[PDB]
Amino acid sequence: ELDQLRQEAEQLKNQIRDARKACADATLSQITNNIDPVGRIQMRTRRTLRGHLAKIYAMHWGTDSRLLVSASQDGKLIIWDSYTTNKVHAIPLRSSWVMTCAYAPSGNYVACGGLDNICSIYNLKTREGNVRVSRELAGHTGYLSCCRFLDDNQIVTSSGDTTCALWDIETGQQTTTFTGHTGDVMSLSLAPDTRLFVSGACDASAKLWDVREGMCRQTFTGHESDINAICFFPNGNAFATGSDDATCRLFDLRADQELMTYSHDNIICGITSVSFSKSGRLLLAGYDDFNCNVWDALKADRAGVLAGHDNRVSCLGVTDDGMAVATGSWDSFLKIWN
Amino acid sequence: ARVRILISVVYWVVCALGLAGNLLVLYLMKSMQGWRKSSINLFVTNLALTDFQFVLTLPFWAVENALDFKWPFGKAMCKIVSMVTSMNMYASVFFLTAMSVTRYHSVASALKSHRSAKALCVWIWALAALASLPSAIFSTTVKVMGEELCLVRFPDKLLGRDRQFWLGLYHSQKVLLGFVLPLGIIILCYLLLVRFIADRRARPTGASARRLSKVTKSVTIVVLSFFLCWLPNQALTTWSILIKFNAVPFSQEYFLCQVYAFPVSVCLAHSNSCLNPVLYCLVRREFRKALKSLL
Amino acid sequence: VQLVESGGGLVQPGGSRKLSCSASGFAFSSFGMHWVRQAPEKGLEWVAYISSGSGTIYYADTVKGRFTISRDDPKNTLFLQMTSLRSEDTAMYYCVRSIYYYGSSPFDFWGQGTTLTVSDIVMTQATSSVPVTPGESVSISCRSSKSLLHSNGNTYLYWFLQRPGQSPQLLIYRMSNLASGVPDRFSGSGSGTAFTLTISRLEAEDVGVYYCMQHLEYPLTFGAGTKLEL
Amino acid sequence: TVSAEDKAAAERSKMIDKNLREDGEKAAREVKLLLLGAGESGKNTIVKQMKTGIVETHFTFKDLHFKMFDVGAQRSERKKWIHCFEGVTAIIFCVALSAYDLVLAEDEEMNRMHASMKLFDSICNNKWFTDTSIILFLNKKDLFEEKITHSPLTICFPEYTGANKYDEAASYIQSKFEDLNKRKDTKEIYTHFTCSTDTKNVQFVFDAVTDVIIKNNLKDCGLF
Amino acid sequence: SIAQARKLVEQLKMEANIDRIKVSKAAADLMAYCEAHAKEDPLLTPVPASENPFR
Ligand SMILES: CCc1cc(O)cc2c(/C=N/NC(=N)NCCc3ccc(Cl)cc3)c[nH]c12
């Protein structure tokens, strides 16, 4: 069985393509073309979180919608207070090549990593008064691109070794390793129930994983190039992707195919960040042309543009209550938009 | 006869150009918040606001000369107009020399920086105010033939109304502290930059020769701009100084120059207030990107 | 984490002494420091305050002009130099650390104590003592003068317990927020002016004197002190 | 209008700002270098002369603190992390001269020097290094000397005139590596020939970064 | 490459056996989520001024 397995592979791919074609009875803008396209919202800046001295590469909100962490290529990791623009902590990183950061749901730990191939977890609520690193997770052979806290004691990391992984923080070990990607994995998103997570990779494909069994459940194609950002719809039944081809897309798990493509002729710069709203109506997508296009999910209308930043927007995030949006760019500035 | 309206139109045009350019520079600098922790940017902002005021105080003299050397409103807005003009023309040249000294410091201590500015700015402003105080405290405008003039030290209080004190030095300190000293400092600084970068030049093609040619072009255009803008007016002023101290070449020369070139010289000297913003905040690529984005 | 403090003793009237507090366990360089004294029979009262990167120093009106507070971070030591010791300064002085970042727990750790023997929102704890029995629910009430609530949602009241031969320990930093090593059988509930503490079950360590301290601005007046007895 | 705890939070924030700007000022005074090469080249010799991801190397020479970001352990895609090095003072690129006739084993029969040339073309014309100077090291020149005689350069460069002199084939290699620069007057490439020794490569990098510092200062002042 | 091919074909055949649903029902579910939480989405519908913590 040298090429018989390969031939079975193409026949199965064709069968999956036919099954996916069978599901699409009509396009999205044929059953959603009856509701009003609410938008035309500009969300002027309310806070400007200055203090960084290099490109901001990743930010993450807290579950209180009050504290947010930001990572920049200067060996700094700042917990802000978006309400009063205060700084709670300033962690000096051992490796300055940070391009992912996380905030634990309990608010006790902050994750960090990048081109050091190590995910570093910091304790914010020590009795000594200083923020110290708890454990340095090291099992990856490529750059870490995203880390999201499963719980207080579990993390999920995506690396540029065509591999995502799940760790036990206390033991600092590979609880389960998620393999199956062809190119580098660039983004993660954990479902609200914390049982599945999507991972978009440089192979122009995104897959759905089961955290417990440790195997892929669904695979998604459609993009022409690298997938940079990914995020879940609030229900956890859909997820949005963003590629370095100036195109966003929305996949739904049950249908197991794309539904809507967010693109325009005047946008040729790709995407670096994608986030959803509280109701998931707003697809806030940070594009490479120094602005964050506030898309509408149910339609493809570019509802708004957040044109504050004078350099490429690398990270944006929405509060748990949807009150604020915090975009971060290569200009060392964070802006809170409301 | 018919040239007074043309000179007034020139005054208004240069005023509009200065206002527009300086507003653009100030808006770009405000957008580039933080001053980039650079001494040159603070100096540029100070100089931009200085020459913005210097070109905004132009319409008063425009309408004053449009009335054939006549002062319309003789009031505290002769104290104030003289104060703003004689403080802006000093702060402009002083920040212009601050540019040269700070560029020399940056280039000479380039690798020394890899191994106060507000204080200097307020010192420049204080010296400008101290130098401009006489212009605003001894103006003492006087009525002559039913029309007044915003002139200086008309009465002969002491030591002669035309001798050294009491209007023999008021606009010779102008020559000695707005043209002669600033130009000397500027030329010395830029000559030192060319000398410093000459040693490095001595692959030269495309890296050293091209860079040194560009640097000498810039440090030549700056000095030529200053000298050409401030030469005619200061030359007329030094002619007035020499005709009021010793020489008396009045016949068909001083009257002709005062009635012909003096408004032209003044508007040319105010044209520096619009040539400085471009040379110091427009040709730079960092501000060029911001201007293109904000256009 | 420990804050051991030395100095103090038999000081002649109209004298001067310096109290020294040494910090070892934690990062002293990033914490504010409060000095809190307590007369041998009377309650607690605030006597000083210094902050991290000392720029804000606050004194009580009782000892404002003759006391001073000094800290030297490199040796992790807190000092208090007092002058012209009047007789009303006989008290047991405590060192308490604090930090004020968002969601911090100020007045969390207290010191051992130093004895001294020399020869504003009003906090009222009307009930001086209560006969309490094992395994019953008890509640302590504290009353204020000005509203302790602030426009930002906070309510600056602090609850402490002073065991018979022990230093005070924080139970409730805000009006409703517990502390690190405190059992979850303590609870707090207040209003604009009225404030109450609740204990679900009395234990063998809960006997002591309970105090309430305001932190609206900086007078930091403590209350009279409710003393549970079994 | 805000409480005492808010005042102390603001004070803590101000202290954090002062520490942050002090750290930034310290970082902006320290020169950054990116090392790239074909692995078989003298990357290891270069790094060992100065003294599972980025092996970042620190050294101090004539009061300039140096950082050398030795990537190469990354088998991932350079396109997805090369922009993080946008802003290095210079790029150090090492190619082995003893590679024209050394085993054509890049993928399976590809000349090593051709691989180095396409790598240099990729780095030089990359859009993140439009104004980033390149310090090209042409290493293993001794093996070049004792291998020109054994084998001609026509196997790698048939267009060569056949002049198999030591200081003509090396000059030809240098010329072919310069010619990949598609944008001059905005970038200088500093090639280096001293020895297989120390005390000169470090000084060469020091001179190149001094020239880059002077150019950066002139551009900051607006003259150039 | 036999093991890799077997793993790939096994992954694809596991992909095939999935009980899918119509795309229209899925779109209806997403819309129902959107206009079931719309009134509590402050970015979409602006919050009153004296409720916004950012003003
Ligand atoms: C460019 C900076 C500058 C320097 C300066 O010395 C004078 C003026 C100027 C003129 N305004 N009129 C005043 N201030 N007093 C007028 C002084 C005067 C002049 C000529 C005669 Cl015949 C009689 C009296 C407008 N700009 C000036």
Helix (H, G, I), strand (E, B) or coil at C1: coil
Residue D2 in any domain: the answer is no
Whole-number Å distance between alpha carbons of A70 and A110: 10
Query: Nearest CA to CA, how far is D7 from chain C (Å)?
Result: 9
CB neighbour list of residue A64: distance below 8 Å, 6 or more residues apart: A107, A320
Written as one string, the DSSP assignment of chain B is --HHHHHHHHHHHHHHHHHHHHHHHHHHHHHSTTGGG-HHHHHHHHHHHHHHHHHHTHHHHHHHHHTSS-BS--SHHHHHHHHHHHHHHHHHHHHHHHHHHHHHHHHHTTTTTT--HHHHHHHHHHHHHHHHHHHHHS---EESSS-EE--S--S--SS-SSSSTTTTSTTTHHIIIIIHHHHHHHHHHHHHHHHHHHHHH--IIIIIHHHHHHHHHHHHHHHHHHHHHHHHHHHHHHHHHHHHHT---IIIIIHHHHHHHHHHHHHHHHTHHHHHHHHHHTSSHHHHHHHHHH-
Query: Cβ(B258) to ligand 1 under 6 A?
Result: yes
Contact D75 A141 (CB under 8 A): yes
Helix (H, G, I), strand (E, B) or coil at A278: coil
- Quoted resolution (Å): 3.1
DSSP-derived letter for residue D47 is H
Residue of chain C nearest A132, judged by CA positions: C27
With beta carbons less than 8 A apart as the criterion, state whether C123 and C222 touch. yes
Whole-number Å distance between alpha carbons of A183 and A203: 5
For the domain made up of B3-294, give the CATH fold.
Rhopdopsin 7-helix transmembrane proteins (1.20.1070)
Bridge-based pairing of strands C44-50 and C114-115 is unpaired
Residue D106 in any domain: the answer is yes
Backbone torsions φ then ψ of A235, nearest 5 degrees: -75, -20
Residue of chain B nearest A331, judged by CA positions: B32
Contact C56 D9 (CB under 8 A): no
Residues closing a segment before a gap in chain C (C–N exceeding 2.5 Å): 119
Query: Cβ(B233) to ligand 1 under 6 A?
Result: yes
Atom of ligand 1 nearest to the CA of B237: 6
Bridge-based pairing of strands D90-96 and D133-139 is parallel
Three-state SS sequence of B143-166: ECCCCEECCCCCCCCCCCCCCCCC
Residue B42 tokens read as: 């603070």
Whole-number Å distance between alpha carbons of C47 and A109: 36
| Cα separations in angstroms, C186 against B174, C177, C182, C194, C199 | 80, 10, 8, 18, 5
Side by side, which strands form the sheet with A119-123?
Answer: A98-103, A109-114, A119-123, A132-137
Distance (Å) from CA B151 to ligand 1 centroid: 8
Tokens 């004298």: give the residue.
C15
Helix (H, G, I), strand (E, B) or coil at A328: strand
Residue B261 tokens read as: 């070139």
Atom of ligand 1 nearest to the CA of B269: 1
Give strand pairing partners of D139. Answer: D96
**If residue C118 lies in a helix (H) or strand (E), which one and from where to where?**
strand C117-118
Give strand pairing partners of B98. Answer: none
- Domain total of chain D: 1
With beta carbons less than 8 A apart as the criterion, state whether A276 and A234 touch. yes
Whole-number Å distance between alpha carbons of C101 and C107: 13
- Give the structural domain span for E14: 2-41
Whole-number Å distance between alpha carbons of A158 and A111: 13
CB neighbour list of residue A318: distance below 8 Å, 6 or more residues apart: A61, A275, A276, A277, A278, A282, A284, A324, A325, E43
C2-118 in CATH: which number?
2.60.40.10
Closest Cα to atom 4, ligand 1: which residue? B86
Whole-number Å distance between alpha carbons of A317 and A61: 7
With contact defined as 3+ CB pairs under 8 Å, the chains touching B are A, D
Distance (Å) from CA B168 to ligand 1 centroid: 14
Residue E52 in any domain: the answer is no
Contact D5 C100 (CB under 8 A): yes
Residue A284 tokens read as: 């806030």
- Alpha-helix residue ranges (DSSP H) falling in A55-107: none
* Of residues D3, D7, D15, nearest to C52 (C-beta): D15
* Of residues D3, D9, D12, nearest to C216 (C-beta): D3
Euclidean distance between the first and the last CA atom of chain D, given in angstroms as a whole number: 50
Whole-number Å distance between alpha carbons of C80 and C140: 33
Query: Cβ(B151) to ligand 1 under 6 A?
Result: yes
* Of residues A38, A47, A257, nearest to E44 (C-beta): A38
Residue E54 in any domain: the answer is no
Closest Cα to atom 15, ligand 1: which residue? B151
Q: Residue D178: which CATH number?
A: 3.40.50.300
Checking A22-26 for CB contacts under 8 A at 24+ apart, the result is A23/A255, A23/A256, A23/A257, A23/E20, A23/E21, A23/E22, A23/E23, A24/A255, A24/A257, A24/E23, A25/E22, A25/E23, A25/E24, A26/E23, A26/E24
Domains assigned to chain A: 1-337 (2.130.10.10)
Tokens 């790239």: give the residue.
D36
Residues of A in contact with B31 (CB under 8 A): 310
With beta carbons less than 8 A apart as the criterion, state whether A115 and A95 touch. yes
Q: How many CB atoms lie within 10 A of CB C134?
A: 10
Among B281, B97, B284, CA closest to B187: B97
- For C58, counting Cβ atoms within 10 Å of its Cβ (0-12 exposed, 13-18 middle, 19+ buried), the class is middle
Residue of chain C nearest A87, judged by CA positions: C101
Among A146, A123, A125, CA closest to A136: A123
Helix (H, G, I), strand (E, B) or coil at C161: strand
Contact A310 B290 (CB under 8 A): yes
CB neighbour list of residue C4: distance below 8 Å, 6 or more residues apart: C21, C22, C24, C111, C112
Count how many Cα atoms sit within 13 Å of the Cα of residue D169 in the half-sphere of its side chain.
28
DSSP-derived letter for residue A115 is T
Determination method here?
cryo-EM
DSSP-derived letter for residue A307 is T
Bridge-based pairing of strands A56-61 and A45-49 is unpaired
**If residue C95 lies in a helix (H) or strand (E), which one and from where to where?**
strand C92-98
Query: Nearest CA to CA, how far is D18 from chain A (Å)?
Result: 10
Domain range annotation of chain B: 3-294
Residue D127 in any domain: the answer is yes
Backbone torsions φ then ψ of A99, nearest 5 degrees: -140, 30
With beta carbons less than 8 A apart as the criterion, state whether A267 and A246 touch. yes
With beta carbons less than 8 A apart as the criterion, state whether A305 and A10 touch. no
Q: How many CB atoms lie within 10 A of CB B295?
A: 6
Architecture in CATH for domain C123-228: Sandwich (2.60)
Backbone torsions φ then ψ of D136, nearest 5 degrees: -90, 120
Checking D194-198 for CB contacts under 8 A at 24+ apart, the result is D196/D45, D196/D141, D196/D142, D198/D49
All CATH 2.60.40.10 domain ranges in chain C, comma separated: 2-118, 123-228
- For C112, counting Cβ atoms within 10 Å of its Cβ (0-12 exposed, 13-18 middle, 19+ buried), the class is middle
- Which site among C54, C57, C150 would you substitute to test the D interface, given the most D Cβ atoms closer than 10 Å to its Cβ? C150
Contact D223 B200 (CB under 8 A): no
Give strand pairing partners of A305. Answer: A293
Whole-number Å distance between alpha carbons of C211 and C221: 10
* Of residues A2, A24, A279, nearest to E41 (C-beta): A279
Among D197, D212, D43, D195, CA closest to D119: D43
Query: Nearest CA to CA, how far is A290 from chain B (Å)?
Result: 10
With beta carbons less than 8 A apart as the criterion, state whether A177 and A213 touch. no
C84-C87-C88-C89 Cα dihedral, nearest 10 degrees? 60
- Give the structural domain span for D189: 8-224
Query: Nearest CA to CA, how far is A283 from chain B (Å)?
Result: 25
Helix (H, G, I), strand (E, B) or coil at A296: strand
Closest Cα to atom 18, ligand 1: which residue? B151
Q: What is the CA radius of gyration of chain E?
A: 22
